[PDB]
Design a protein around this ligand. Structure first.
Ligand SMILES: *[C@@H]1O[C@H](CO)[C@@H](O)[C@H](O)[C@H]1NC(C)=O
Ligand SMILES: *[C@@H]1O[C@H](CO)[C@@H](O)[C@H](O)[C@H]1NC(C)=O
Ligand SMILES: [Ca+2]
Ligand SMILES: [Cl-]
Ligand SMILES: [Cl-]
Lengths: 177, 529
């Protein structure tokens, strides 16, 4: 774990970045990375949501001890998983996710890059990105463990949270190690 | 100080310091791409050559080729000031050259300034950025204003509908200009992270198309789309091969192979090409933007319905009576239109825009009903207004609102206006309301100086002040994404409340601009087919 780390304790917690309403980015390609440690089999780690009314979203999660991303940019849900690396072991891990239109990459540590190429024509724009929620409380799957080095499309979100950025709201059982 | 020099990434240029509001530095005839001549006719533009020493950019370069001829001209599509004043206008295009990719920079003397880039154009066939002087807007708004020249007509938009000539060269030119600006505006004290593109008419259509192209990514953040959209009958050419063939056959390039056909066209003298008459179906274009699958990747309707565009701050609008020309020839001595002329006029409209047999007896009767003032159905002057309204609604308002709704729906900050003012002049009959192009003088501060040869308006104190209001809104938007903010309140537009600014002597926020008429065109008329 390097630099700004946050610990998430029993009962849960949350870190929310709201984009100023006049400046919600729409993207054709995305890039998400984070460092984590957890013993949990189930949690939502990070979730980027489009404004109310729109279905587009991107969600980094753990399911059956395996890290993956599920996103939607207008066609269907597309899922990508590292379905071999056990990552719920209390040890530090890095996950890197890439999206390009309907296509996506994922890798964990130095394991081979997983690629996903969904079949049929695909929408490509993630519209009107409104909130980055870190912690999984809202999704009903709170994360417990540590997070560091969050990067989303250039935004080093956790540092921003460390430096009291106006748009960040920190709630619940979350501590700035 | 008087002839200031700026070192661009291609070498130093020398401009003029011009007084009018502080003085403005003018750099005219700056080259932004290599001449699209020879092998590079019907190809994408290429970057310009660099030079040593100082290059004078102190007068307008040669303009792009165009042949202005009543009867070749697309009258219904050109703004009133253009068609009203075409002698003193041919004056601005009398010096042509295929080598014409030049832009002009207006820099106010006064960190890093916003940049407004204007895309001129009436019909894609004509014009030059040079007839708009950006000095007043620049100096009043403390923003850099750039005007451009891009390839026009055949040279700018010829396409075969296959790989031989993919088209959109003029749009590619606008992109190349924006690339130049991104890399070089800093040297003039511009901020590449605050580039607003804007335009009126066919220029507005370009601006809308550019918001749908992956090529635009990073080159600008805001757009102002005045009196045009990507969705009108005349915004896009869905039948380029047909018109290219007519041209080829006229100039003796009859080969059937499209690759050989283009090479033959490529070696022809351009003057021979522009002298031809290729007349398009009424209200459509022979040469213009096409759906090539790369630059414009699909029908704009589909792209916008589906949300396939990035998040630009957008301002758009329309003028009260854009469609003045629709009543050419049928207005009598008393400024009225007869019932027979009303019928004929709606009948011909149906034939030109809804030429499906049958279902058109129905459509014609419905349109007549919709555009009759049932509370004053005998008044010939009202008949006239409604006819101008029919065409204005159909060609401008309905698609503007369609466009506004779709940007707003996908979360891009949207601002809508209805422009209800225009200058007193002889360019236009006294009964007419604000016509196509009438906003231009206000956006560019012309009243602050006086009448010009193109806008021979008799301006009043009110005109000066309305111009001040418009430029403040426009440049505020350039600065912050919000026309109310430099660092009367114009509410944001979303498709729920649909608030818009009524721009006139007394500006005011209102809602659902002509919603019933827009519904009629967008909702009812499609069903019924
Ligand atoms: C550029 O034009 C100015 C206009 O007066 C002139 O003085 C100057 O000599 C020209 N450029 C060069 C390189 O001489
Ligand atoms: C402007 O309006 C005035 C008002 O009487 C009148 O002289 C005429 O309509 C216009 N003036 C000029 C010089 O055209
Ligand atoms: Ca989408
Ligand atoms: Cl009516
Ligand atoms: Cl209405």
């Amino acid at each position: 774990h390097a630099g700004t780390t946050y610990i998430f304790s029993k009962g849960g917690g949350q870190i929310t970045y709201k984009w100023p309403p006049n400046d919600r980015p729409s993207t054709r390609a995305d890039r998400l990375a984070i460092g984590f440690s957890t013993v949990q089999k189930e949690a939502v780690l990070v979730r980027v949501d489009s404004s109310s009314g729109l279905g587009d979203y991107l969600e980094l999660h753990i399911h059956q001890g395996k890290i993956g991303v599920k996103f939607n940019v207008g066609t269907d849900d597309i899922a990508i998983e590292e379905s071999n690396a056990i990552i719920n072991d209390g040890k530090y891990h890095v996950v890197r996710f890439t999206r390009s239109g309907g296509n996506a990459t994922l890798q964990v540590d130095s394991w081979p890059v997983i690629e996903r190429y969904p079949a049929g024509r695909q929408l490509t724009i993630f519209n009107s990105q409104a909130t980055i929620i870190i912690g999984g409380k809202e999704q009903g799957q709170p994360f417990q463990g540590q997070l560091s080095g969050l990067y989303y499309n250039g935004l080093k979100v956790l540092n921003m949270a460390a430096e009291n950025d106006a748009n960040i709201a920190i709630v619940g059982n979350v501590r700035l190690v | 100080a008087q002839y200031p020099v700026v070192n661009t990434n291609y070498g130093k240029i020398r401009g003029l310091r011009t007084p009018l509001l502080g003085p403005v530095e003018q750099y005219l005839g700056v080259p932004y791409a290599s001449p699209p001549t020879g092998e590079r006719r019907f190809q994408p533009p290429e970057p310009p050559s660099s030079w040593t020493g100082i290059r004078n950019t102190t007068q307008f370069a040669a303009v792009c080729p165009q042949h202005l001829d009543e009867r070749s001209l697309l009258h219904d599509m050109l703004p009133i000031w253009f068609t009203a004043n075409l002698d003193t206008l041919m004056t601005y295009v009398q010096d042509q050259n295929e080598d014409c990719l030049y832009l002009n920079i207006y820099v106010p003397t006064e960190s890093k300034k916003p940049v407004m880039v204007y895309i001129h154009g009436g019909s894609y066939m004509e014009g030059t950025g040079n007839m708009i002087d950006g000095s007043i807007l620049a100096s009043y708004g403390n923003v850099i204003v750039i005007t451009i020249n891009y390839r026009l007509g055949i040279l700018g938009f010829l396409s075969t509908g296959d790989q031989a000539a993919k088209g959109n060269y003029g749009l590619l030119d606008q992109i190349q200009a924006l690339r130049w600006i991104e890399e070089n505006v800093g040297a003039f004290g511009g901020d590449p992270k605050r580039v607003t593109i804007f335009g009126s008419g066919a220029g507005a259509s370009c601006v809308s198309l550019l918001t749908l192209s992956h090529y635009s990514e990073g080159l600008f953040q805001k757009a102002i789309i005045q009196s045009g959209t990507a969705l009108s009958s005349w915004a896009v050419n869905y039948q380029p091969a047909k018109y290219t063939r007519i041209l080829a056959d006229k100039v003796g390039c009859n080969m059937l192979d499209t690759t050989d056909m283009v090479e033959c066209l490529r070696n022809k003298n351009y003057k021979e090409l522009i002298q031809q008459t290729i007349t398009p179906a009424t209200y459509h274009i022979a040469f213009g933007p096409v759906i090539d699958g790369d630059v414009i990747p699909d029908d704009p309707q589909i792209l916008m319905e589906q949300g396939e565009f990035l998040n630009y701050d957008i301002m758009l609008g329309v003028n009260q009576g854009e469609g003045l020309k629709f009543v050419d020839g049928i207005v009598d001595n008393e400024d009225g239109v007869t019932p027979n002329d009303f019928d004929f006029s709606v009948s011909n409209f149906v034939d030109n825009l809804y030429g499906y047999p049958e279902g058109k007896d129905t459509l014609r009767e419905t349109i007549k009903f919709m555009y009759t003032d049932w509370a004053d159905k005998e008044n010939p002057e009202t008949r006239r207004k409604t006819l101008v309204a029919l065409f204005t609604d159909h060609q401008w308002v309905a698609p503007a609102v369609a466009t506004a709704d779709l940007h707003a729906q996908y979360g891009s900050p949207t601002y809508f206006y209805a422009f209800y003012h225009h200058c007193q002049s002889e360019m236009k009959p006294s009964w007419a309301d604000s016509a196509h192009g009438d906003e231009v003088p206000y956006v560019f501060g012309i009243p602050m100086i006086g009448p010009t040869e193109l806008f021979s308006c008799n301006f009043s104190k009110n005109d000066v002040m309305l111009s001040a209001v418009v430029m403040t809104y426009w440049t505020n938007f350039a600065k912050t994404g919000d026309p109310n903010q430099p660092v009367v309140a114009w509410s944001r537009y979303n498709p729920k409340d649909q608030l818009y600014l009524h721009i006139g002597l007394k500006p005011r926020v209102r809602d659902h601009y002509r919603a019933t008429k827009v519904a009629f065109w967008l909702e009812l008329v499609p069903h019924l087919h």
